[PDB]
Amino acid sequence: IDPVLEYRLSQVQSRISEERFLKNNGSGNEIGFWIFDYPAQNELQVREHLKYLLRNLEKDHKFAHLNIFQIIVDMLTERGLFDRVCQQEVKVGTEALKKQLVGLLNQKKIADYIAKKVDLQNQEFVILTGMGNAWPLVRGHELMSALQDVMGFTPLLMFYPGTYSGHDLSPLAGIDSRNYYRAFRLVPESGPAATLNPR
Amino acid sequence: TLQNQEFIAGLKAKFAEHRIVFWHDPDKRFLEELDNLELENVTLLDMTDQSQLAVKKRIEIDEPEQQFLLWFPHDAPPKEFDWLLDIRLYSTEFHADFAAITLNTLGIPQLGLREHIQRRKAFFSTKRLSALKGLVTEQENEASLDKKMVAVIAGVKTAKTEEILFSLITQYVNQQKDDDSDLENTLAMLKRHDLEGVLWDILNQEMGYQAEHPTLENLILKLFCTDLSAQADPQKREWLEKNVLATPSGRASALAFMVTWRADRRYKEAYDYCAQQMQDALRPEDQYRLSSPYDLHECETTLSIEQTIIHALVTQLLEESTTLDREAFKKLLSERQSKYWCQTRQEYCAIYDALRQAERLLNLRNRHIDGFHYQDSATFWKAYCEELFRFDQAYRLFNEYALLVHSKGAMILKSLDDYIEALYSNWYLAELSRSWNKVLETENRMQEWRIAGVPRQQNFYNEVVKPQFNNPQIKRVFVIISDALRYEVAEELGNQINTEKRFTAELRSQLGVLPSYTQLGMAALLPHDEICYQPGSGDIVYADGLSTSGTPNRDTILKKYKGMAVKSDDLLKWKNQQGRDLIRDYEVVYIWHNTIDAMGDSASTEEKTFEACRNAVVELKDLVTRVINRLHGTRIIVTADHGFLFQQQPLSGQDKTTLQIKPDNTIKNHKRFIIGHQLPADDFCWKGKVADTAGVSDNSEFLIPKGIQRFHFSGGARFVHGGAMLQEVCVPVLQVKALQKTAAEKQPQRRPVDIVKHHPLIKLVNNIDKVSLLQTHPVGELYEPRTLNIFIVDNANNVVSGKERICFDSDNNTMEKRVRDVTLKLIGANFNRRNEYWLILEDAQTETGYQKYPVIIDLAFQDDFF
């Protein structure tokens, strides 16, 4: 076990039953999102903990289930929309065709299918699985930018396989050039507040 | 077979703890054996044709307990669509690839470090492998492999962060100016293998540099700031202490590194950019401004530090430190001349003697700030010959040194020239003017002709020249005869050669002809029993009735003493081995000489007599050749015809009070005197008996301005000569014998000594016979020390005699006295009488057919004489 990530993961259930999470009390009059950068290779620990958390948190609160790579697999099998958008050619010529084959997955539109899977506004939250499988075209701060179209005020947590410096998000071997801030740090990277399971 | 056993063992070692194993196979290393593989559960996935989304799904979602071996004929699919990249990263690859080629092509055979080299699989090609074998020291470890892999990308052949940095800083100096990025391509290639982390890590372990987001720009800031801080203004350090290297151990590394960068001129080069970066960031020079100059002997950080000290001392000389800050004035000088920018740029070194020789002039001024005063002409002369021409030297020097800072157009001091020149015109000249008048007023030497101790010019060839025969060698030496010389040439040339050997002298001087212009100085030295002024010549003169001017007359003056003369057009290095012969009776021999006089009555250059203090000074620390002990030569023969002045501005009032009644027999009238009969002195004219003082057949008195006052400006006004005093009539009878030639040197080929014979042709008649080498013209400072390989030849250097190897160490006098019999051994009548033959003197130190002079031999054998 890594006890620092196990502590930060246990603080998913602590923040959820603490006031700030479901009251959205950054300013309260906000969508109550949250942030959870985690050591990128600890995939199994976060996946398995959230497969456990789907079983444990119903003692306290109301939610449903998501699988990160399943949501993509449910609509694609290879670049897929690539193979389908080949239809553009006759309609307006080769310009829109080529730009839509090349410039794939504009991330705004990720919102609706998760709202068809789960009644997001009726939940207190939703629990994820498959986790750090993130290397299609879906990015952490973009997913957090998309789902606010449909989550309403209900919290979402940016589990991300890497780091968030309190500003710069980055997964895996060092990727992306972007931030997220509407979301509160669930537990930061650092200090004793990041590590509260001593003996 | 065994590659399959180790393929099986390597796959087993992956599948023991990872459910999924990659195996990229562009080398297709086990393409046939896929089902010979012993693995429990494992499914091979050739990924190449797969829907890689749906086979990530297979691997992760669909088959969560199934083991998988992935395969491709290339690397990963495109990372923007690489669904599998997270797995690819957190999981493992089976190495179908073999380490042994890489290991042994690195040299490094090591089956442990193999696993880091495996972590470096994407690094390798035979070039890098073997280059690294060229650097490998097989007690390697991962950190040395890292440091060396850095070094391998960096092109150096020792792996140390200073030297790596020196390379990278080369690449920074490129990247900052001249179209380069291989610094950052190196850094990126470091990062490609984790090594850039290790670079900026060991930049702390060795160079004590860190940043959160480092670049060589930020390091070069931090490290420049280190030695900038170590050399910061002690009056203003702290505000520049705060941009430095991340650790004081880094500061200490950076000082040793920058001491290296200075000392080791390999890596000076990176100051081609630091001094460009390091101003406009803070303009700290403009923040420093009035900080103390002379204390900065210490600090060499920038052009601006230097220009601070300049303007802070230009300040001190427009504030015009006559009253002298002496030891601070000194504190800076030699240190700067030796310090980096000075060592790059000599004009800066000149600053420090634009200082040093002003440090003279103003110390000199202070100690004699009312001009000078002594009790009579002998005690003024005594002080003059200690020091009271050094105020010429110092002024001249430091102005020319200031002007040597200015050499590249850098007039970075200008207007204090106008202060120090006002010392000249309006004070230095202006005062002693009056002072030695009060002595000539005390003495009236005018018609009262004796002065204590000091000798006189008035009878030299009659009562001194042949009286120099008091040593048994002596009858004769060669003369150079010169026009215009401010006496201090004949102190600088000799004192700045107190370092020389039997090239030698003694501190001595004597009083010249009282009217100070060239030709009366000449007349008293024209070889004589009597000195002649005659009608029809006017300002041209004679002795023994033969005249100072016109070439046929000039060689003829001397024939009374067997002699001849040569021009300043010709003397310079006047023609080679024939110099043994054209002269051999001549008790007197003459050369004419004129660079400063050609700046003088050339009125366009009188205002440019500081340029005589350049052009003639570059000739006049120098002079001789043809004398020091070798092929026999003996003494000085030149001395002052007249002294002269210069001053950088239009004249003071004291520069030009003037004449009484001009004499009817005006023998010359001039910018600073007139010669002629019946003239006793006046408030600002000295006037006295030339007939007492001159020894010439001349009735005259003189008109001279008393003090630095002046007359009809014929050929000068800021430059003048004529009157009573020692920038006009100090004459250098310094005891002297030889010097350092560059004066009067240019036009003829060389005259590499002269050496051969005492014969008509080089013709010999004994069976073994004397080549009687007549020692007449040594080496000295252009002519040769060459060992002579003397032998007779045909036109083409083919031997027709025995051979002699010859050199000398003698300075002996009387030209009739000086044969050396180099007795050669001779070969009958082999000489082809239709063709020419010669005595080759090889340069025996290079032994070519180097030089030859004419021979024909056809022996009348020994019995014909005896």
Residue numbers in the entry:
A (entry chain A): 3 to 201
B (entry chain C): 2 to 867
Text from the published report:
BREX (Bacteriophage Exclusion) systems, identified through shared identity with Pgl (Phage Growth Limitation) systems, are a widespread, highly diverse group of phage defence systems found throughout bacteria and archaea. The varied BREX Types harbour multiple protein subunits (between four and eight) and all encode a conserved putative phosphatase, PglZ, and an equally conserved, putative ATPase, BrxC. In this study, we identified a stable BREX sub-complex of PglZ:BrxB, generated and validated a structural model of that protein complex, and assessed the biochemical activity of PglZ from BREX, revealing it to be a metal-dependent nuclease. PglZ can cleave cyclic oligonucleotides, linear oligonucleotides, plasmid DNA and both non-modified and modified linear phage genomes.
Large scale co-expression and co-purification of His-SUMO-BrxB and PglZ yielded a clean sample of native PglZ:BrxB sub-complexes. The Salmonella PglZ:BrxB sub-complexes were used to perform structural studies through negative stain transmission electron microscopy, followed by cryo-EM. The final model displayed a GSFSC resolution of 4.45 Å, but the features of the resulting map, while clearly indicating the presence of a protein volume and dimensions consistent with a PglZ:BrxB complex, did not provide clearly defined features corresponding to individual secondary structural elements, likely caused by the influence of very strong preferred orientation of the particles, with a corresponding cFAR value reported by orientation diagnostics in CryoSPARC of 0.04. BrxB is itself predicted with high confidence to form a globular protein fold, and further predicted to interact with the N-terminal domain (residues 1–96) of PglZ. Examination of the model using EMBL PISA identified Salmonella BrxB residues R49, N135 and W137, and PglZ residues K58, E62 and D88, as forming the core of the predicted protein–protein interface (inset). The remainder of the PglZ protein is predicted to assume an ‘S’ shape, similar to observed particles from the EM analyses with a central domain (residues 98–292) and a large C-terminal domain (residues 304–748) that contains the metal-binding site identified within PorX, and a final extension including a seven sheet β-barrel (residues 749–867). However, the orientations of those two modelled regions, relative to one another, differ significantly when comparing the same independent AlphaFold3 predictions, consistent with a possible flexible hinge point in the protein backbone located between residues 96 and 99 of PglZ. Collectively, our mutational analysis of the PglZ:BrxB interface supports our hybrid cryo-EM and AlphaFold3 model. Alternatively, and due to the observed data in Salmonella and E. coli, we postulate that the role of BrxB might be as a scaffold protein, participating within and allowing connections between multiple BREX components within higher order complexes.
